[PDB]
Structures are given as C-alpha cells and as structure tokens.
C-alpha cells in the first residue's frame, strides 16, 4: 500500500457502485444504482531483492514492472559501484531510469 519505486504508481481513489435490476439491453427496466462509496485501488506492490556489485538491493516495486528492474541491473554493468553502500547503489540504479 505505497508507491512503486520504478513507475511511481500510487494508490488511486475509485468508487464502489452497487447496482440492482436488469439491464435495458437484456429486455429489463434498467439498472438502479443503490449506493456509491469511496474506496482505494492500490498497486500490486511486491519486494524484489537483487545482488548488485556484491550488495543486496531491495525494491518495493509494483508487480507490473518487475522486469524493468532487471533491465536496470543489466544497464548497471558499466558503472563504478564497488564499495558503495546499498542506498547509494539504489540511487544510482534509480538515476539510470
């Protein structure tokens, strides 16, 4: 329930719309909305732990972008990353986006 670190995907606000009755297309009288409320649609956030230059990097990334992360690791094959802390490596990878 947070932000994708790759796509920036954020929880959104959508409506829950309860309906009763038969649709007009099906020979019915029509759909009567019997209630609307607010609700949140979160991304499908998951954890992705990858090894980069000897350090363990964790990404809280939406599922729909798990492959993108690996692209970063590929694109990280030509960076001076030896010795740096995990946070600095993560900043480098994100800057590669």
């Amino acid at each position: 329930s947070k932000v994708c670190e790759i796509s920036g995907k954020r929880p959104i606000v959508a409506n829950s719309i309860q309906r009763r009755g038969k649709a007009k297309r099906e020979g019915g009288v029509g759909k009567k909305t019997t209630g609307i409320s607010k609700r949140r649609q979160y991304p499908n956030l998951q954890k992705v732990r990858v090894r980069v230059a000897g350090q363990e990097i964790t990404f809280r990334v939406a599922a729909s972008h798990i492959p993108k992360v690996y692209e970063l690791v590929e694109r990280a094959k030509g960076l001076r990353l030896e010795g740096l802390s995990p946070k600095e490596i993560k900043k480098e990878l994100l800057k590669l986006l």
Binding site: I66, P67, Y70, E71, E74
Partner: protein, 147 residues
Amino acid sequence: MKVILLEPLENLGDVGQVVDVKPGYARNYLLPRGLAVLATESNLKALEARIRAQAKRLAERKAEAERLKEILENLTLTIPVRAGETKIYGSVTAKDIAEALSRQHGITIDPKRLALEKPIKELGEYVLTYKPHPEVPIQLKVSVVAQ
C-alpha cells in the same frame, strides 16, 4: 520468458542455447545461480558476436593448417644417419624430425604433435601423420637414409 543458458543443463538445453522458461524459474533460480542470462537484445548481440568470433578463429585454424598441409606433402624429408645394414645405430625421433624440418626447408613444427609411438630404428621410407588440427591430418613422407 526466453533466456540464454550459460552451462549445459539436463533436460532443458545446451550451453549458449536460447530456451523458454517460466519467469519465476529464471528470476529465482537460473539467473541468481549464474546459469542463464536474460535473452535481452544487448546480450543477444553479445552471444551472436561470440559465436561469430569463435567460428572466425576456427576458420583461421583450419585455413592456417590447410596452408601448412599445402606446404608439406610436396616434399620428402631426407635424414642421413649412421647405420649398418637396415638397422640404425642411433634413432630418429620426433625431436630429430623437427630439427631436420627446421634446418632444411625451414619449417618450425611441433614435435609433440607428430604421431610416433616408438623411435624410428630402421631405414627406409615412412609416412607419418602430423595432425596440427583434428580432421586436418598431414601425411609426411620421410626417407630415413644412411651415411
């Protein structure tokens, strides 16, 4: 999700082959243990380039060995030694054949490659295989003579 294998893996594929596996089996097993890389465009170009370079050095080996075989077979190495009747007092060895082929004709050849199990102890005309490259054998006719 297509991947490029790094090692031969049982009932799955050969080293260097591009196979098709579920994304979980690649992300959480093959790629961590360094058994396969993602079949992206970049490393696919890299694999194509490595295959090209390997075939290039193989063609270089075969062409160089074909030139070396064109050098031989059109010559007879004549080695004079000391001998009584058909039996030689000393022995002509691969090292001696190489010393001869470098002193006359001027070819530096690898003596270890010459197929010669036992030292030549008799006189006459012999034919020996050199084999600088497998499937590319060279027939050398040497005339072990006396005086």
